[PDB]
Amino acid sequence: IGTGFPFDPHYVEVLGERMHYVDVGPRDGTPVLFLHGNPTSSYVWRNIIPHVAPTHRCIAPDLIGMGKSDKPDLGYFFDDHVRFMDAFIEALGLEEVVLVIHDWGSALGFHWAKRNPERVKGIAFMEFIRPIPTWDEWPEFARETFQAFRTTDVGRKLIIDQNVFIEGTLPMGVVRPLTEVEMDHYREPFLNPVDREPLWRFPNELPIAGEPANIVALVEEYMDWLHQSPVPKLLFWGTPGVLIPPAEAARLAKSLPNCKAVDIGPGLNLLQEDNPDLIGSEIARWLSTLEI
């Protein structure tokens, strides 16, 4: 499994800030837009892109506050990410896209697609944001720790002051051990404790047991859109999962129109880090089939 990130940095000014993005592959045709989540960056896609890039343009931004993108003194609410991602997509002139999305990047991508349904030609997704109706549907092993994260004093202490989302949660979201290079590359954006705001606001945004009500609503709205859309869909899932347990993956593979579902083997949240070969191969192949 490659630890390298052999992509030249590109930057675009967005709302007066700058965002970093990978942009590889051919200049024409429909681009594939890869959206990471918490607490990753475009780095999470490094072993998936090289399988897609021979045939398609691959664009992988770092969310505002993350990666190599700028770090303005925001609250990094989901609304903030929405604003910056809408503006990134316009600043690059993108017209139609294929979306490849994960964790909070999935809330972004689905919320975009709902609002711009004529510009979305396919969606591949994995470990994605859906409403978690009660805390019982959060996995038991991570339950206590996510509940602590969703406080101000204790959660900030953990995420911001002790860097637990990077040091603890991130390796607990991958079945294989991450290597020290890997860990250092995920550490890099968050060396300064003050830059850890998004790492804490994210889990506080998770739509769990009805809260926060605004996020619950928005997520329900794009899940309804999704259930009704004929757009081609590709769902990766793993066992036991985190956000998407196998039973849920099986239900969505039948409930969503035009949905192909692919089991990656063992997986928790960062499926890309457990089976990037399968994921990149199956995306490249599926992309071919969107023309058939």
Ligand X SMILES: *CCCCCCOCCOCCNC(=O)c1ccc(C(=O)O)c(-c2c3ccc(=[N+](C)C)cc-3oc3cc(N(C)C)ccc23)c1
Which residues here bind Cl ion, judged by CB under 5 A? 38, 202-203
Residue 169 binding partner per list Cl ion, ligand X, none, with a CB distance cut-off of 5 to 8 Å that depends on partner kind: ligand X
Q: Which of residues 126-145 bind ligand X (CB under 6 A)?
A: 142, 145
User: Cα dihedral angle (157, 140, 276, 190), rounded to 10 degrees?
Assistant: 0
Query: Is 18 or 187 the residue whose CB approaches ligand X more closely?
Result: 187
Distance of CA 100 to the CA centre of its chain: 8
Q: How far is the CB of 173 from ligand X (least distance, A)?
A: 3
Residue 12 binding partner per list ligand X, Cl ion, none, with a CB distance cut-off of 5 to 8 Å that depends on partner kind: none
Q: Quick one: tokens of 83?
A: 């604003």
> 256 phi and psi, to 5 degrees?
-85, 125
**Sole window of 78-86, 166-174, 214-222, 254-262 interacting with ligand X (rule: CB under 6 A):** 166-174
Q: What is the three-class DSSP state of 8?
A: coil
Helices 140-149 and 197-205 sit at what angle, rounded to 10 degrees? 120
Q: How far is the CB of 95 from ligand X (least distance, A)?
A: 29
Q: Which of residues 66-125 bind ligand X (CB under 6 A)?
A: 103-104
Q: Which of 164, 218, 262, 283 binds ligand X (CB under 6 A)?
A: 164
Give me Rg for the CA atoms of the chain: 18
Q: Which of residues 169-228 bind ligand X (CB under 6 A)?
A: 169, 171-173
Q: What CA–CA distance (Å, rounded) separates 21 from 35? A: 10
Q: ∠ CA(63), CA(115), CA(47), 5° rounding? A: 40
Q: How far is the CB of 26 from ligand X (least distance, A)?
A: 31
Q: Which of residues 256-275 bind ligand X (CB under 6 A)?
A: 269
DSSP run (H or E) holding 142? helix 140-149
Q: How many residues bind ligand X (CB under 6 A)?
A: 17
> What would the x/- binding string for ligand X be over residues 8 to 47, using CB under 6 A?
-----------------------------xx---------
Query: Is 30 or 275 the residue whose CB approaches ligand X more closely?
Result: 275
Query: Is 154 or 290 the residue whose CB approaches ligand X more closely?
Result: 154
Q: Should residue 287 be labelled a site residue for ligand X when binding is judged by CB under 6 A? A: no
Q: What CA–CA distance (Å, rounded) separates 268 from 251? A: 18
Residue 212's contacts (CB-CB under 8 Å, 6 or more residues apart) are 204, 205
Q: Which amino acid is at 199?
A: L
In the complex, the residues that contact ligand X under the rule CB under 6 A are 37-38, 103-104, 142, 145, 162, 164, 167-169, 171-173, 242-243, 269
